[PDB]
Amino acid sequence: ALLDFEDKNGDKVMAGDEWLFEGPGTYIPQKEVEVVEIIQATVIKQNQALRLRARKECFDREGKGRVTGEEWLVRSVGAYLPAVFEEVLDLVDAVILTEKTALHLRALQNFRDLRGVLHRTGEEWLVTVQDTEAHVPDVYEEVLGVVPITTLGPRHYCVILDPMGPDGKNQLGQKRVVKGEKSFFLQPGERLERGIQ
Amino acid sequence: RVEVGPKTYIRQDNERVLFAPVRMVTVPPRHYCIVANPVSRDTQSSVLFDITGQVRLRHADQEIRLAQDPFPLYPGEVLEKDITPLQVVLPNTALHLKALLDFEDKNGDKVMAGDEWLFEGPGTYIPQKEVEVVEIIQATVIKQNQALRLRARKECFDREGKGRVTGEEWLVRSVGAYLPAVFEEVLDLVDAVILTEKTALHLRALQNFRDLRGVLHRTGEEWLVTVQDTEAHVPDVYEEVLGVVPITTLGPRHYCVILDPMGPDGKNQLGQKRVVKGEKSFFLQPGERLERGIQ
Amino acid sequence: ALLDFEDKNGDKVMAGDEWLFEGPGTYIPQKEVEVVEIIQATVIKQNQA
Out of B220, B260, B273, closest to residue A134 by CB: B220
- Taking the CA of residue C23 as centre, how many other CA atoms within 13 Å lie in the half-sphere pointing to its CB? 1
Distance CA B29, CA B86 (A): 9
Contacts of C14 in chain B (CB under 8 A): 122-123
Strand partners, A104: A126
Residue B242 in contact with partner chain A when CB distance is under 8 A:
no
> Can you name the residues that pair with A86 across neighbouring β-strands?
A54
Integer Cα distance of C30 and C21 in angstroms = 13
Rg from Cα positions in chain A = 24
Helices and strands (DSSP H and E) totals, chain C: 0, 0
Please tell me which residue of chain A has the smallest CA distance to B112: A25
Q: What is the DSSP letter of A82?
A: P
Chain A: give the shortest CA distance to residue B158, in Å.
Answer: 15
Distance CA B31, CA B127 (A): 10
Pairing of β B184-189 and β B222-225? unpaired
Q: Which residue of B has its CA nearest to A179?
A: B271
- Reduce the DSSP state of residue C28 to 3 states and report it: coil
* Phi, psi for residue C40 in degrees, rounded to 5: -65, 135
Contact B182, B117 (CB under 8 A): yes
**Gyration radius (Cα) of chain C, Å:** 15
Q: What is the SS3 assignment for B129? A: coil
User: Of B112, B166, B220, which has the smallest distance from its Cβ to A133's Cβ?
Assistant: B220
Q: What Å distances lie between residue A154 and A149, A180, B268, CA to CA?
A: 16, 4, 15
Burial of A62 (0-12, 13-18, 19+ CB in 10 A): exposed
Residues 6+ apart with CB under 8 A from B88: B123, B124, C2, C15, C16
DSSP state of C19: -
Give the gap in angstroms from C-alpha A25 to the nearest C-alpha of chain B.
Answer: 4
Residue B31's identity, in one-letter code, is H
Q: Is C36 on the interface with B (CB under 8 A)?
A: no
Q: Is A178 on the interface with B (CB under 8 A)?
A: no
For residues B72 and B19, what is the distance between their CA atoms, to the nearest angstrom?
A: 14
Count of Cβ atoms closer than 10 Å to residue B123 Cβ = 19
Alpha carbon separation from B248 to B17, B164, B169, B276 (Å, rounded): 96, 42, 36, 11
Q: What is the rounded CA–CA span in Å between residue B224 and residue A5?
A: 65
One-letter amino acid at A75 equals R
Does the distance separating the beta carbons of B166 and A43 come in below 8 Å?
Answer: yes
Strands B255-259 and B216-217: unpaired
Nearest alpha-carbon partner for A183 in B272, B275, B289: B272
User: Interior CA angle at B231 toward B228 and B233, to 5°?
Assistant: 100
Chains that touch A (3 or more CB pairs under 8 A): B
* B116–chain A nearest CA distance, Å: 9
* Cα angle value A34/A38/A44 (rounded, 5°): 150
CA distances (Å), B219 to each of A98, B119, B241, in order? 9, 40, 14
The answer to whether B89 faces chain C, any CB pair under 8 Å, is: yes
- Residue A190 CA to residue A102 CA, distance in Å, equals 15
Task: Encode B193-225: b = buried (16+ Cβ within 10 Å), e = exposed.
Answer: bebeeebbbbbbbbbbbebeeeeebbbbbbbbb
Resolution for this model in angstroms, one decimal place? 4.9
Neighbours of A95 (CB within 10 A): 21
Residue B100 near chain A (CB below 8 Å) = yes
Q: Give A192: exposed, middle or buried? Use CB within 10 Å, 0-12, 13-18, 19+.
A: middle
Nearest to B141 by CA among B92, B102, B195: B92
Contact map slice: A 114-153 vs B, CB within 8 A: 133-134, 149, 151-153
* 3-state class percentages of chain A: helix first, strand second, coil last, to nearest 5: 0, 30, 70
> Which of C3, C14, C16 faces B29 most closely, judged by CB atoms?
C3
**How far is Cα B142 from Cα A66, in angstroms, rounded to an integer?**
51
Strand bridging mode A71-74 / A50-54: antiparallel
Report CB contact under 8 Å: C15, B123.
yes
Q: Is C6 on the interface with B (CB under 8 A)?
A: no
Instruction: Judge residue B75's burial from the number of C-beta atoms within 10 Å of its C-beta, 0-12 exposed, 13-18 middle, 19 or more buried.
Output: middle
In whole angstroms, give the CA distance from residue A108 to residue A124.
10
Beta bridge partners of B199: B246
The C-alpha atoms of residue B191 and residue A106 are separated, in whole angstroms, by 44
The verdict on a CB contact (< 8 Å) between B155 and A79 is yes
Solved using: cryo-EM
Which runs of E-coded beta strand occur in chain C? Answer: none
Distance CA B7, CA A191 (A): 109
| Vertex B97 angle, CA B92 and B98, to 5° | 165
In the three-class reduction of DSSP (H, G, I as helix; E, B as strand; rest coil), residue B244 is classed as coil
**Secondary structure tally for chain A: helices H, strands E:** 0, 13
Q: Do C17 and B89 touch (CB under 8 A)?
A: no
Report how far residue A149's alpha carbon sits from residue A185's, in angstroms, rounded to the nearest whole number. Answer: 5
Decide if C16 touches B, using CB distance below 8 A.
yes
Q: To the nearest whole angstrom, how far is the Cα of C23 from the nearest Cα of chain B?
A: 27
User: Could you tell me which residues are beta bridge partners of residue A107?
Assistant: A141
Task: Report CA-CA distances (Å) from B237 to A93, B190, B210, B280.
Answer: 17, 9, 12, 34
B119 alpha carbon, distance to own chain's centre? 12
